[PDB]
Design a protein around this ligand. Structure first.
Ligand SMILES: NC(=O)C1=CN([C@@H]2O[C@H](COP(=O)(O)OP(=O)(O)OC[C@H]3O[C@@H](n4cnc5c(N)ncnc54)[C@H](O)[C@@H]3O)[C@@H](O)[C@H]2O)C=CC1
Ligand SMILES: Cc1cc2nc3c(=O)[nH]c(=O)nc-3n(C[C@H](O)[C@H](O)[C@H](O)COP(=O)(O)O)c2cc1C
Ligand code: SF4
Ligand code: FES
Lengths: 62, 433, 217
């Protein structure tokens, strides 16, 4: 079996905002690394572009 | 006096398709003699606005089956040029079971279609006309090409097309056995060398069509009448049929009739008069009639109770819960298996789905299996309502209107012939237990 | 019922990428004429006709024919494979010299299309998917051919034969076997889409050029 000696190997905490997480870690005395939230960028979609008269976007199949 | 009430007796002086039977020469010399290619230059010189107005005044509705008003639809390409060429596509697929009007127009009056292409392209500002014809219509396509050749030689199309100053080309592209390619967007895709799979709308073809250019898709019958409407006027064309149901119409009467045929008739003719006059009535008498599909397989069937008093136009048949469709009357007498006919239509639709979208691709095959079990009686009554709901899920949830045409005949059969289904199930249970 | 034809390709000694296929020079002239119709930069639009042209020279479409069309039009071969498997008029297997297609849809079935199908089967000794051992005939059933008024009807190598009874289709088969070609059209003294007797309309002479023209034109 898989053995461990780490008592915190399973602990996961959930926070509303990064500030709450940072405050919790600071008051508990843990060194922390924060990563900014990554969101998908807004993309311009257009169905008609699939059938461009002169553009490269035209689909070869559908 | 205006507002006629008894439509359905018009003489040959008011029929557009005078060579419907092909008795007369189908060649250009014959076309000209009948009244074709007359004052084309004058019509072209009147301009697109004048041409568009004539279509609008006539009230002409699309003869391909949907009945969308033709003038408004054609006016969608009246925009100024944006650098892209403009095209007119003629829908000559004619895949609807029970329908043979476009075949006759193509084989026996091709110059009417060529002139209609020229006038429609002038109205839309189009550059050339692509005529997408059924692949199985080899001889019809060859006659069409001969007609286009003799029109090119006589200077009726091509460069300047007339003493007009307008350049117009007419191309014939043949399909390869696909009923779905009758749909306008699927037709456009098949012209561009792809599978005949319909597009989503928007965009509409007037914005992004064939080769990505503004396009207008029109039914063969819709285009052929275009020059006769221009010459005689929209007011004359309108003087036939009820309000919002103007003009004449080709009807294909087939099935259990004494003389199956095709005939031009006024729009709002009653169904009974049309069947008993031109088709020779139902074999076994009018009281032998069981059901009628008034507009090709895509329309729900109606029983004899409705058939005796319904008019053959868009709004009248909509009020009868069926629809005019392609004006392809299929008659079934009291001697046929009404469930088997609908099952065969559902099998046709299962074999004709393109498979692109989920509701059609899965549910039409599902409905085919259910209907094949219904024919034998394998099912239970609780499935009939179930089948109804399956159709409802399919209808209005698909890209293409083939799903509607698959779900409507089943709804018609269930709406009007449920007791036959239930007694078939009871019989199968009785001799099987 | 189910289609029966497979939509995968497995190489065979008679159908592999090295099966000999090439267009005739006349077919190359026809290909150039077909290509010219479409707008420049949209050459693919010729996949549908040119593929058909290949089948009109070879009889069917071997995988090498699809590869040749794809290379000639500079289209990826999978696009030509899609086109070939989508459309039902393309023959991805060899067929007989005469391809009999009988319509069995509802308007055509209501006028006793099964009688025609059984007559063909008993005349040829083959079923609705098979090819005669002489490799002359192949019988299949098809959906609506657009000749419903003339039902029951049959389509043979671009010729419609309509208003058929068992005897007419049997004698058409006899005429096709003995090395003759039969005249297409109705087989009941109709030769049109007209009513079978009487000609209810279009009896009067057609009007002349300009008869109904409106004022100011
Ligand atoms: N001739 C034949 O053999 C066959 C005929 N049909 C008929 O096709 C009918 C349904 O087909 P659909 O194409 O779905 O009709 P549809 O309801 O989608 O519209 C028909 C025409 O009006 C145009 N249109 C509609 N709304 C528009 C808008 N807001 N803007 C611009 N253009 C617009 C469409 O582009 C199309 O050209 C059926 O009723 C059927 O009877 C079906 C199969 C075969
Ligand atoms: C599955 C399907 C098949 C169709 N087949 C045809 C056809 O063969 N011929 C035709 O004129 N219209 C056909 N239509 C309807 C076309 O959308 C119609 O022709 C197009 O909208 C322009 O027709 P119109 O001139 O009557 O307005 C079909 C529609 C669907 C959904
Ligand atoms: S409804 Fe049927 S034919 Fe139309 S796009 Fe969907 S799957 Fe294809
Ligand atoms: S149903 Fe047979 S040709 Fe139409």
């Amino acid at each position: 079996w898989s053995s461990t000696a780490d008592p915190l190997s399973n602990l996961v905490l959930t926070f509303s905002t990064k500030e709450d997480a940072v405050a919790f870690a600071e008051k508990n005395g843990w060194s922390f690394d924060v990563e900014e939230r990554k969101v998908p960028k807004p993309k311009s979609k257009s169905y008609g572009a699939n059938f461009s008269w002169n553009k490269r976007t035209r689909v070869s199949t559908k | 006096a205006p507002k006629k009430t008894s439509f359905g007796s018009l003489k040959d002086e008011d029929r557009i398709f005078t060579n419907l039977y092909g008795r007369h020469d189908w060649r250009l010399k014959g076309a000209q003699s009948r009244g074709d290619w007359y004052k084309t230059k004058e019509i072209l010189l009147k301009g697109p606005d004048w041409i568009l107005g004539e279509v609008k005044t006539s009230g002409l509705r699309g003869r391909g089956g949907a009945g969308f008003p033709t003038g408004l639809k054609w006016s969608f390409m009246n925009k100024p040029s944006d650098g892209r060429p403009k095209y007119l596509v003629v829908n000559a697929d004619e895949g609807e079971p029970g329908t043979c009007k476009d075949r006759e127009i193509i084989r026996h009056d091709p110059h009417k279609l060529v002139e209609g292409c020229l006038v429609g392209g002038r109205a839309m500002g189009a550059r050339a006309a692509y005529i997408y014809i059924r692949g199985e219509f080899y001889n019809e396509a060859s006659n069409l090409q001969v007609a286009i050749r003799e029109a090119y030689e006589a200077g009726l199309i091509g460069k300047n097309a007339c003493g007009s100053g307008y350049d117009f080309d007419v191309f014939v592209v043949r399909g390869a056995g696909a009923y779905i390619c009758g749909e306008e967007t699927a037709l456009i895709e098949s012209i561009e060398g792809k599978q005949g799979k319909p597009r989503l709308k928007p965009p509409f073809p007037a914005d992004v069509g064939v080769f990505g250019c503004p396009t207008t898709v029109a039914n063969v019958e819709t285009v052929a009448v275009s020059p006769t409407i221009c010459r005689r006027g929209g007011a004359w064309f309108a003087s036939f049929g009820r309000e919002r149901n103007s003009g004449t119409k080709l009807f294909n009467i087939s099935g259990h009739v004494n003389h199956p045929c095709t005939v031009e008739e006024e729009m709002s003719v009653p169904l009974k008069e049309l069947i008993e006059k031109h088709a020779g009535g139902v074999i076994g008498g009018w009281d032998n009639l069981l059901a009628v599909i008034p507009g090709g397989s895509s329309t729900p069937l109606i029983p004899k109770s409705v058939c005796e008093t319904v008019l053959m136009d868009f709004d009248a048949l909509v009020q009868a819960q069926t629809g005019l469709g392609t004006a392809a009357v299929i008659v079934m007498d009291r001697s046929t298996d009404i469930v088997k006919a609908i099952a065969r239509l559902i099998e046709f639709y299962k074999h004709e789905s393109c498979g692109q979208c989920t509701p059609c691709r899965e549910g039409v095959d599902w409905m085919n299996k259910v209907m094949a079990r219904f024919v034998k009686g394998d099912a239970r009554p609780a499935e009939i309502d179930s089948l109804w709901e399956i159709s409802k899920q399919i209808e209005g949830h698909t890209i293409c209107a083939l799903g509607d045409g698959a779900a409507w005949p089943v709804q018609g059969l269930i709406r009007h012939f449920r007791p036959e289904l239930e007694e078939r199930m009871q019989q199968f249970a009785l001799q099987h237990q | 019922g189910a289609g029966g034809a497979l939509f995968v390709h497995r190489d065979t000694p008679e159908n592999n990428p090295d099966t000999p296929f090439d267009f005739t020079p006349e077919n190359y002239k026809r290909i150039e004429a077909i290509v010219k119709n479409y707008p420049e930069g949209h050459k693919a639009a010729a996949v549908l006709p040119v593929l058909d042209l290949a089948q009109r020279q070879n009889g069917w479409l071997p995988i090498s024919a699809m590869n040749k069309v794809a290379e000639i039009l500079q289209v990826p071969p999978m696009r030509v494979y899609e086109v070939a498997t989508f459309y039902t008029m393309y023959n991805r297997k060899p067929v007989g010299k005469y391809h009999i297609q009988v319509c069995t849809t509802t308007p055509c079935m209501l006028r006793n299309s099964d009688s025609i199908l059984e007559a063909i089967q008993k005349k040829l000794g083959i079923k609705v998917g098979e090819t005669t051992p002489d490799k002359l005939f192949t019988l299949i059933e098809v959906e609506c051919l657009g000749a419903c008024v003339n039902a029951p009807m049959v389509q043979i190598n671009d010729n419609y034969y309509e208003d058929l009874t068992p005897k007419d289709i049997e004698e058409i088969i006899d005429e096709l076997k003995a090395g003759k070609i039969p005249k297409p059209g109705p087989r009941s003294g109709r030769f049109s889409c007209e009513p079978a007797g009487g000609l209810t309309s279009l009896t009067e002479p057609p009007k002349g050029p300009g008869f109904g023209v409106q004022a100011g034109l």
